[PDB]
Every structure is written in C-alpha cells, then in structure tokens.
Design a protein around this ligand. Structure first.
Ligand SMILES: Nc1ncnc2c1ncn2[C@@H]1O[C@H](COP(=O)(O)OP(=O)(O)O)[C@@H](O)[C@H]1O
Ligand SMILES: [Cl-]
Ligand SMILES: [Cl-]
Ligand SMILES: [Cl-]
Ligand SMILES: [Mg+2]
Ligand code: NA
Length: 297
C-alpha cells in the first residue's frame, strides 16, 4: 500500500578504486571548506571484489526466494570502475559472476528433486540508450514498451527470457551479448520463478537487477543530461527523504525498476569513484548524486 509504512530505502555505497561510512573531500570553491558525504557503506582502495559482494550484494539474494525484488546499480564517471565492480575479469570476478554462481547454486539446492519448491531461473539482458529499451539477447528487434500488470508487476512483453540452470548456461547467453557502452545503461535481469509442490501451492517470483549504468559525466546537477540517470537521482532522493511523490514514470530506467526500487524491494546503488586529479569534478558530482547526507565543514 501507499500508506502503512514508508517505502524501503535505496542503500548507497561508495567504492573508491586504487590508482591505475562518511567520505571527506576538499572543496576547491573554498579551500577553508571540507565536503563530508554520508553513505550506508564505504569501500576504500584495499576493498576487493569479494568485500563489495559479501558486504553489499550477497545478503539480499535470500530475499528473491521470499518473492521480493532487488536492484544493484553501479554509478559513476567513465574510468571510475563501474564495469570492474559489476562484471570484473576471470582473475577478479565482479558482482554479476558472483551473484550468478550463488543464486544458481541456491536454486539447484532449494529446488532439487524431493524439495517442497520447484525453482526455475531465467535471464534477460537489455540496454537503455537515448530513452529506448533494447534487447541485447535479440538484437535488431526494436525499442521495447514497458508495461505493468494489475498486481503491480513490471513486464516487457516479448523481451527475450533465456532459461538457465548452470553458470555455462548464463555464459552462453551473456558473454556474446556483452560484445557507446559508456553512454548506455546495461541491465541484466535474473528472475527466480518459485512454485510450491505441496499445499498451499503458493507461487512466487523474485527479480534481481544487475546494472552497469552510463557514465555520470552525463549527470551534473543544475555536459548533456541522461534522462534515466537524472530521474534515478530524483527517484532515489524521493525514496531516501520519504517524499510523497516518486517520479518512476519520468524515465525508462525508473519505470522498468518501479517494482524493484523502494516498496518492499532491496536496492543498492554503488557510487564508483577514482582518486586521480583528472576525475575531481565528476567525483564531487557522483558524491552529491549518491550521498544519503551532505555537510560543509
Ligand atoms: N577497484 C579496482 N581495482 C583495480 N583496478 C580497477 C578497479 N576499478 C576499476 N579498475 C580499472 O580501472 C580501469 C577503468 O575501470 P572500468 O571498470 O572500465 O570503469 P567504468 O566502467 O566506470 O568506466 C580499468 O583498467 C579497470 O581494470
Ligand atoms: Cl587489505
Ligand atoms: Cl579484487
Ligand atoms: Cl519487492
Ligand atoms: Mg564500464
Ligand atoms: Na506502504
């Protein structure tokens, strides 16, 4: 319901990468002033892929098996480390390979033969570019329309869904679709379909979003404005300040995530930042965007 409890918060974290939970940064407008940003978590340069994942992502997976939705988004300027955090490499796997291994192992266990629940994992992969929704699994299929059902579920009819059981099944569809990317939102959707095999025969579904956003060079508060980054900011603020109006419908991203941001959903936004001087303006801007609180000290 709209009333009877405020909406769930959007958790916010900062990941400061090495040179290649409050943060303090110099104010180059006034050198007597220091900018102090507050987050739900802070991961410094010594924080590894497993630290990010065990600290902020692993704990929300169990909520997908309760029929709850979850969103993980990497925000920040190009070069900051969004793709490193979200995808990573075979040496240092990111959030996506870690959550996929865990979720598939969890569903292979909880949905095994003889278990009271039948579990089926599917995947979808899309891109948000210039407010157009594009299926990365079925390219050259056009701008997709986002709909809503009578129960409040967000759905994209005809967006391709691939059934997956093992990691190889995930790799089969994901790796080729992964291969501009700095200027578009990469949305991986992992859907857990749950069927009770004994009375009362309940049916659940948990949707997990893993998002590698467009570079925040395109999101300096009032460079071009990315409608979906701008509206995400408004939506995150509305949810984390308890404002009566949340403008989900003002962008494709927030409309797609309407049932996976706020409500009873679990969500984590990671503000990826870099330590180099050449990033300073985009660092300040990413911190203003994502911080749950800000002070001038
Ligand atoms: N936490 C990190 N530790 C080490 N290297 C990192 C880290 N994050 C990013 N990098 C490196 O920084 C560069 C840019 O990172 P990338 O993930 O492509 O950023 P983005 O996707 O935000 O533009 C790459 O060479 C990548 O390996
Ligand atoms: Cl360490
Ligand atoms: Cl690492
Ligand atoms: Cl939910
Ligand atoms: Mg990237
Ligand atoms: Na409510």
């Amino acid at each position: 319901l709209y009333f009877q409890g405020p909406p769930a918060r959007v958790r916010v974290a900062v990941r400061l990468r090495p040179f290649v939970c409050s943060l303090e940064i110099a104010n180059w407008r006034n050198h007597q002033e220091t900018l102090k940003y507050q987050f739900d978590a802070f991961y410094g340069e010594r924080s590894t892929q497993q630290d990010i994942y065990a600290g902020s992502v692993q704990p929300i997976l169990r909520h997908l098996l309760e029929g709850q939705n979850a969103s993980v988004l990497a925000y920040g300027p190009t070069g900051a480390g969004k793709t490193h955090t979200m995808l990573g490499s075979p040496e240092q796997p990111g959030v996506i390979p870690r959550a996929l291994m865990d979720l598939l192992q969890l569903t292979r266990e909880e949905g095994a033969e003889g278990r009271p629940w039948a579990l089926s994992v599917t995947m979808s992969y899309l891109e948000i570019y210039q407010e157009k929704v594009l299926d990365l699994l079925d390219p050259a299929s056009g701008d997709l329309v986002i709909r809503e059902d009578c129960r409040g579920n967000i759905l994209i009819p005809g967006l391709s869904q691939k059934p997956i059981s093992s990691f190889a099944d995930f790799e089969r569809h994901f790796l080729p679709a992964s291969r501009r990317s700095s200027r578009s939102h990469a949305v991986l959707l992992v859907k857990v379909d749950q069927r009770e095999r004994l009375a009362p025969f309940r049916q659940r579904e948990g949707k997990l979003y893993l998002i590698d956003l467009a570079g925040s060079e395109d999101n300096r508060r009032t460079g071009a404005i990315n409608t979906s980054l701008f509206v995400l900011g408004k939506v995150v603020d509305a949810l984390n300040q308890g404002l009566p109006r949340v403008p989900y419908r003002d962008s494709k991203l927030t409309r797609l995530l309407q049932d996976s941001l706020g409500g009873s959903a679990h969500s984590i936004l990671i503000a990826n930042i870099a330590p180099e001087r050449r990033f300073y303006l985009d660092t300040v801007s990413a911190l203003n965007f994502a911080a749950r609180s800000k002070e001038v000290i």
